[PDB]
Amino acid sequence: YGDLGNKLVLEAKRTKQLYARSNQDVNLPMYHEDIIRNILKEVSNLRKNTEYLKEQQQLGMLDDKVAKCQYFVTLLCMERNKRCLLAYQRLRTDILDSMAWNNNGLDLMSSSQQDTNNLSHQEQEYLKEYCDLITDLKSGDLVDIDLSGSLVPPSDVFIDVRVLKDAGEIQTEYGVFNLIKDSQFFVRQSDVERLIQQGYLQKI
Amino acid sequence: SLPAHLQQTFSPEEIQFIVENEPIKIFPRITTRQKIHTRWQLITTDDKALNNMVAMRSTEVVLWIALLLKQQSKCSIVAPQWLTTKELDRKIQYEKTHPDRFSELPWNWLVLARILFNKAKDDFHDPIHELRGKIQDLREIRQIKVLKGLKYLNESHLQLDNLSLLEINELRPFITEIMDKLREIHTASL
Amino acid sequence: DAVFGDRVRRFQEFLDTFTSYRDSVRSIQVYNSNNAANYLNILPHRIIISLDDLREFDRSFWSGILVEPAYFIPPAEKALTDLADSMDDVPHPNASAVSSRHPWKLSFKGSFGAHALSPRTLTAQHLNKLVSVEGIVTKTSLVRPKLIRSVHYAAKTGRFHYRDYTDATTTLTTRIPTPAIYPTEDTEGNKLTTEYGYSTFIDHQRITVQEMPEMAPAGQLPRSIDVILDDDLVDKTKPGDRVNVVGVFKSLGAGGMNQSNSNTLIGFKTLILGNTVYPLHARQMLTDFDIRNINKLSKKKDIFDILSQSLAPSIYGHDHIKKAILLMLMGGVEKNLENGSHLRGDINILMVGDPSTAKSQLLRFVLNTASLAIATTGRGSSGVGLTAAVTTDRETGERRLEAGAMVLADRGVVCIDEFDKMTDVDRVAIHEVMEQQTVTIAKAGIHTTLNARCSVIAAANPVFGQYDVNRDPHQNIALPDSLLSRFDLLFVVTDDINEIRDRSISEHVLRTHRYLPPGYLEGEPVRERLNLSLAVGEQAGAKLAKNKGNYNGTEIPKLVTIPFLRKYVQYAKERVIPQLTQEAINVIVKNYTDLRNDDNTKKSPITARTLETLIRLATAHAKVRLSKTVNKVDAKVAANLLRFALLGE
Amino acid sequence: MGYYDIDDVLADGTEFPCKFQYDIPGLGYLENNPGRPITKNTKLSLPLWLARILAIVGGDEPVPFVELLPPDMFSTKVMNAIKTDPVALDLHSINSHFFSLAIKWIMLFSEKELANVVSELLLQRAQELNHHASSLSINTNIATSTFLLKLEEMEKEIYKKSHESYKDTKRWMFK
Amino acid sequence: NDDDNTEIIKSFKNFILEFRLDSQFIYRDQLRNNILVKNYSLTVNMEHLIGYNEDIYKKLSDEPSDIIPLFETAITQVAKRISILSRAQLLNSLPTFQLILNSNANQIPLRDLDSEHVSKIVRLSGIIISTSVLSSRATYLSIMCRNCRHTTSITINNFNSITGNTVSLPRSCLSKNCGPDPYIIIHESSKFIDQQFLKLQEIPELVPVGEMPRNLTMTCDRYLTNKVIPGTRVTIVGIYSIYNSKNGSGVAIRTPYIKILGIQSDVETSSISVTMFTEEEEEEFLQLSRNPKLYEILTNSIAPSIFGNEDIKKAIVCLLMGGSKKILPDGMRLRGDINVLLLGDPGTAKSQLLKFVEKVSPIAVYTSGKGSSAAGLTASVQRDPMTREFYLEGGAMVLADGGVVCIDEFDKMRDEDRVAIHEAMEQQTISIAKAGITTVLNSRT
DNA sequence: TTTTTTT
DNA sequence: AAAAAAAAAAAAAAAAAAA
Ligand SMILES: Nc1ncnc2c1ncn2[C@@H]1O[C@H](COP(=O)(O)OP(=O)(O)OP(=O)(O)O)[C@@H](O)[C@H]1O
Ligand SMILES: Nc1ncnc2c1ncn2[C@@H]1O[C@H](COP(=O)(O)OP(=O)(O)OP(=O)(O)O)[C@@H](O)[C@H]1O
Ligand SMILES: [Mg+2]
């Protein structure tokens, strides 16, 4: 018996559709560790039952065919439970890494989801480790090229930029930009992509 | 990169980039022939033409440099032999008279057309609307031929001798997945 | 031209490829020959093909049939006639019968796909194409013969002459019409006398089929289409039946394209030339292992209560009601005596009770479970319109009786809701049909008695909002005792307020509302579906697939599924006619004498007719256990059930 | 065959009819009264993920514990229905894992007569999928929706991918 | 005579093939997408027609019935040009394409139509009350003679200028010595289209003083059929023309009617059982559904001018959403609606909520309990004036199936009329047994 | 005197 | 040139009856 596991797996499918329709990593939903621990306790029951049945099989009063068929059935049940759990976990890890790869590996809690409370503690420490790896990777031979930069090919040099949020003044190379609220800039493309990804600039 | 399976095909922006990475002829307005000044000394283009240019003489530069100079007043792009009515006419006649072979046309079909129409609106000898309509006619005819040819899809291979870039790009996923499923069925049957 | 010959020979090749149809033809021929002069049934010249085999043989001919039957069916019929003629061998035939020239028209079965429609979906682009439409039978016309080919004789010449007449609806192909003028003069002035008994006449009947109202759009009325069928199958079925008809959908008539038009917005006629008809019935036969399973169930000790509990599992309590319904669905036999006239044979049951105690739901379940049933409401019916109607048929201009509601359900069951809310006038009609099960219509020059042997199940509300248990039972009911004494069994249901029963029924109801159709997720509502893949459809004893009936594990006692129960009812109502014995007589008479003189309060007074109810209940219970004789156990159970229904546990 | 694929995991969960070719005491505990054993030739509806194995183990006449009966989805009725006209068939109604189940069934039992018909079915449906994918807006008929609601789940991803490809190409072309 | 037709067709084809905004030829792309999904139709916006050229608009304004067929055949010529290869020389199952117009002219009410609008394009709006069943009309007729016995084809256009407009049968035969009209119609090998009739009633709030609403008749054909249902506000664009009445009173009478060319509806036939919204609108609906407090937004939005009442508004919203329909293996149905009764003191504005609820719900009817009867709500049995045959016509409660019904003054209705609704609301199916007609009709509201 | 029901 | 009308269903106003 492992039908309950399907209830988990089916749910995961919906989350993928959430990724599919949006086409943007955002608002990962709350976990389902309750059903997971339900499956864990039932599989502990299955394991103890299998151990007991092996005990009586070794005891001599248990039929060999009954013992073997019970063993195979229980083993298949454990196999399906494990498959369901890892099927959930792999997708969760994949979407977590996809989210972590594009935000420069800083987790950006100041400005995706706000609380990140919808993630398990193990998932959060995994996210921290992946951010560590992301920071480490660009610190080696590829220091001159930012791996977490844009992916749109550079098509034009001068674009119009309209302010979205207010700040003070920000220095650049050979100049300084004052982020007055709701103004327009005629600046170089390769200077403001960092701000645009941060959400402080609009109207590319 | 993955970003929702963007790791399997090309986005139209990448196609436009890989097309503008191509050489073209130019008709410069200014002169920078060396005093007999700053060296161009690029890393992915022969700077000799850039350094050795003089006004009102034809020379070859990569496309995006020509576009940048056209954003300024130092450029005059020379259109290819396609972009004229009397060549497109014989081309459409060739498609009409041969209902099975796609006409000979390069990979950069319709992309150079879009870019030149968007930027170099004024340097043409022909009205823009006529050329746009004829290009639209070519697009429709080739689309019809593609639909006609797609009817049969062997599980072994196929030949598409004269498809341009965008036409292949748009059709890649559907065709690939259909033949993958057919191959899976056939192999599973054996 | 020669395309007809090529198609004919190709069809001959196809017929020669398969051997089943030739076997059917020779069986028909030998049966007809055996029925000639050997010390009344005849087999019509029709054979059913399965066009799946035709598709598997030739796609071109199959496509030609299913797209343009006009140019394809007649060649097939001609080839079939030629093959039948060649196989036929009658050295010594008759004279008038040999000139029939029956062409052996065809019938079809198999998968249609996009050509199985509904009366609402039929439209312009489906014309001239073989189709198969489902629906309900609304009304039928009158059988009328029509002429095809006449025979003439002249005394001087001695040469018989024949002229053949065909109309637009007679043949699929349009030809120059011929009037019905009898030619009585030869080319040289000889007198010609029409020879009856040698001419050809075929039956004709028109019916109209209507889409089922259940599958209807949002706030739209059901619609109907016109069907013509002739020759054989001319008077099958009746109004109020679920049918599926396969035929050609064609247009006919000028429609006003001639000078006869009076307005610009005229139209054309549309009509169906039916080829074959099947009883949809939403199948009715018994297999060998089906009979084995029925027998092994019957020989069990406790089949009756299992069958009772099997009825409507979603209704809590009311076990005795379920038992009463089971006994009513398969009631006792009719009795007719050369001197004693007739005795009523089935059971009638009435329900009166406090509101919202699941009476209408059980009545709906009885509607769905029973074979033939019709639903009526007290406020939505008129007594005169319930039994018969005087309407004029359009084609003949003659007024003919139209069957009423309960006449259609003869030998079936009729369920009435809001019975006490009916107009009193209509009630008297009910009494008539409860008196001798016969309705007589004498009006506008028609004097006829119509048979109606149906049983009635009904539910009614008390006079007040709720039943008053401290009052006279007659005080609580608005119906006169004249018809209340007719009903065999009367039940009073009241929802006593007890927290234990409240919790139990709450658990049951909450269990019900958490149900999901198999193979369907819970996030989206129920959608409409397509019909079955085949327009026409049709190792033993070792599987017990649906025989045990226990679909899921919820209680130790067994359960049976609805189709098996209906099969059991069908077997029981035909294969056994039990007879009572003297021991059951002794028990019944003892119980009747005791009950007559118990002399205490009771819900209703008792009289002699209750002994008839005991007899019929014992007969029904004997039918339940499939025995040809009534034993005292059935008398005991009938007495117990009567005591529960009239005294109260 | 992918371990970490959602659709395959879901498709493994469907139930297939099967019969106990062999009689084993003490079984059926997980479905009925545990104390009563299961007698021989008993029909059951077991899930695929265990019926696939229990039909091949043998265990031991090394006959397997279970014998798997032909499922109702693969019936002559459905074969005729799919052959006569596949384009208008609502194959979604028959099952919502039809193609993967077909692949697994044909893998378990090699049958040349299913491969060709299924291949032709999907090949014919692909043309209409392409037809609808090419169409774009710029007042909507029922044909498109009633077709789209009949699809198998595995064709939906092809439809979406093609639709997005065409939409992106159109958007780039017109600016 | 033919030269003018050729010039007009050429001009329309030039307009179709030459009109472009920005970098898009809108109508050619529309034609391609329409042909792909087997919707042989095209939609013309009148403003584009005027802007491209004014003389063609003038000609379309002067004689609509004479001009429209030329355009609707130029469309099919262009479609054949840009969808089928000539292959240096087949099926050709492309009928004449349907032309549908849209415009934004000044509305003209029903009662303002007079003799000066004959054979003119007009725009108007009303309410739909009754719909006729479908019917067939011939477009390509195969005609065979009897004596000479030769075949001929007649092509029929569905536009009528004069009342007759029909060549019934050619006089004499084609070349011996046949009769007047020895021709018959070959029913096989012919082409037929579909036609339907509709009735329009005046909008309630434009009725002039002390009057009764007036009815009008409309004819629709091909794709325009089966698009509306009775009781839905619509906007129609068409031609106002007349047809003679020989079978009919007066002298030289000619009953007028409307030929539908374009229909705009408020519900867009969406509920009439699948979802067809675009991705933008569905995304917006999801975005609103994602709001954490949309319950209060909807509660406030129910009758903003009514002050103070809260639980009643919550109940009204809950009723509008409705329950969840269920079904069971044994056939038992379970109701999926909720029924609310307001039983209050005078002056508390009970009906002011009723008419607003009628306004909000997509399917709603408002009626008084005093002016109602049992036969006038569930089902009414009529009989035809001519053929006398009985038929079933639905009332009010069936007309609002799949929606909600607004009844006020529930007590004033007669006791006999208050018992017919019991089954109609407890089981949602009404049964009729009258004049031999037995029918189980469903009503979900 | 009033409302109900039948003609 | 003519099928045309008896049989039903539904909506009132008057009178008489019961409370
Ligand atoms: N024992 C029961 N088991 C299940 N449902 C029950 C039971 N008793 C009552 N109900 C529920 O009570 C509701 C009453 O519905 P329904 O109108 O059919 O009842 P009723 O007693 O026939 O009422 P009425 O006399 O008003 O027609 C139903 O929804 C039904 O499911
Ligand atoms: N809460 C309220 N806020 C504003 N206006 C109100 C409110 N209650 C009543 N009204 C006013 O009452 C007036 C009349 O109300 P209406 O006649 O619809 O009330 P009702 O309760 O339906 O009456 P009835 O029981 O007599 O049919 C309206 O003009 C409306 O403005
Ligand atoms: Mg009820």
Ligand SMILES: [Mg+2]
């Ligand atoms: Mg009011």
Ligand SMILES: [Zn+2]
């Ligand atoms: Zn002639």
